Enzyme design. Structure first.
Site, PDB file in Angstrom:
ATOM      1  CG  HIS A  63      31.919  69.481  38.820  1.00 12.33           C
ATOM      2  ND1 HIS A  63      30.783  70.259  38.678  1.00 12.33           N
ATOM      3  CD2 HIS A  63      32.762  69.841  37.810  1.00 12.33           C
ATOM      4  CE1 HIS A  63      30.946  71.048  37.626  1.00 12.33           C
ATOM      5  NE2 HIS A  63      32.173  70.787  37.089  1.00 12.33           N
ATOM      6  CG  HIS A 108      29.740  70.726  54.181  1.00 18.95           C
ATOM      7  ND1 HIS A 108      30.784  69.910  54.576  1.00 18.95           N
ATOM      8  CD2 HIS A 108      28.688  69.901  53.908  1.00 18.95           C
ATOM      9  CE1 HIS A 108      30.370  68.652  54.538  1.00 18.95           C
ATOM     10  NE2 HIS A 108      29.071  68.649  54.123  1.00 18.95           N
ATOM     11  CG  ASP A 142      26.131  68.571  47.801  1.00 23.05           C
ATOM     12  OD1 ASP A 142      26.527  69.634  48.325  1.00 23.05           O
ATOM     13  OD2 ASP A 142      26.700  67.951  46.877  1.00 23.05           O
ATOM     14  CG  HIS A 174      27.515  78.334  49.916  1.00 21.96           C
ATOM     15  ND1 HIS A 174      27.027  77.974  48.673  1.00 21.96           N
ATOM     16  CD2 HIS A 174      28.201  77.253  50.389  1.00 21.96           C
ATOM     17  CE1 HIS A 174      27.406  76.730  48.418  1.00 21.96           C
ATOM     18  NE2 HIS A 174      28.133  76.285  49.484  1.00 21.96           N
ATOM     19  CG  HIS A 207      19.540  71.958  45.749  1.00 22.58           C
ATOM     20  ND1 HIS A 207      18.750  71.843  44.617  1.00 22.58           N
ATOM     21  CD2 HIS A 207      18.716  72.371  46.754  1.00 22.58           C
ATOM     22  CE1 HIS A 207      17.508  72.176  44.940  1.00 22.58           C
ATOM     23  NE2 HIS A 207      17.490  72.503  46.264  1.00 22.58           N
ATOM     24  CG  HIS A 221      27.799  73.664  47.732  1.00 19.41           C
ATOM     25  ND1 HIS A 221      27.401  73.134  48.947  1.00 19.41           N
ATOM     26  CD2 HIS A 221      26.733  73.544  46.891  1.00 19.41           C
ATOM     27  CE1 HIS A 221      26.149  72.716  48.829  1.00 19.41           C
ATOM     28  NE2 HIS A 221      25.737  72.971  47.555  1.00 19.41           N
TER      29      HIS A 221
END
Length: 153
Positions: free
Chosen positions: A63, A46, A83, A120, A71, A48
């Site tokens: 951003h 999550h 992240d 994603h 990452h 992103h």
């Protein structure tokens, strides 16, 4: 005390359920949830957002966060925010999470309240190999769901 909730929803099938509990006056926020729709595999983490100036869910900074910067993970550059990299489903996509963040806070200096939890649509493959894609996302970045974490009763 703070019992947030985030009913995944977007693509359609992705109906994960992530709730944020912090039954502590000086403890971390017990973050745990469960996805529903994905498939036994790897799916970007999550938090992103490549770009955005219209705001569809929240609004702060499409951003990532300056806490993670990248990452991170295997290189460990910060990833102090939400992240990490990628997760994994069970045997039917059902992806469950379980972590405890204290440094952060529902509200205050590090207000986590407003984390568009999304999944994603692809497999970062723990790295594509190149750079400037999987280093920030996972060579895919496909926003669908939006399990925003909000306070609830």
């Amino acid at each position: 005390a703070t019992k947030a909730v985030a009913v995944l929803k977007g693509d359609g099938p992705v109906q994960g359920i992530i709730n944020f509990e912090q039954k502590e006056s000086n403890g971390p926020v017990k973050v745990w949830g469960s996805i529903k729709g994905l498939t036994e595999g790897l799916h970007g983490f999550h938090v992103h957002e490549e770009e955005d100036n219209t705001a569809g869910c929240t609004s702060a900074g499409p951003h990532f966060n300056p806490l993670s910067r990248k990452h991170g993970g295997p290189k460990d550059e910060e990833r102090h925010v939400g992240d990490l990299g990628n997760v994994t489903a069970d045997k039917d996509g059902v992806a469950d999470v379980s972590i405890e963040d204290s440094v952060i806070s529902l509200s205050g200096d590090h207000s986590i309240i407003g984390r568009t939890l999304v999944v994603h649509e692809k497999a970062d493959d723990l790295g594509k190999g190149g750079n400037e894609q999987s280093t920030k996302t996972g060579n895919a970045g496909s926003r669908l769901a939006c399990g925003v974490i909000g306070i609830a009763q």
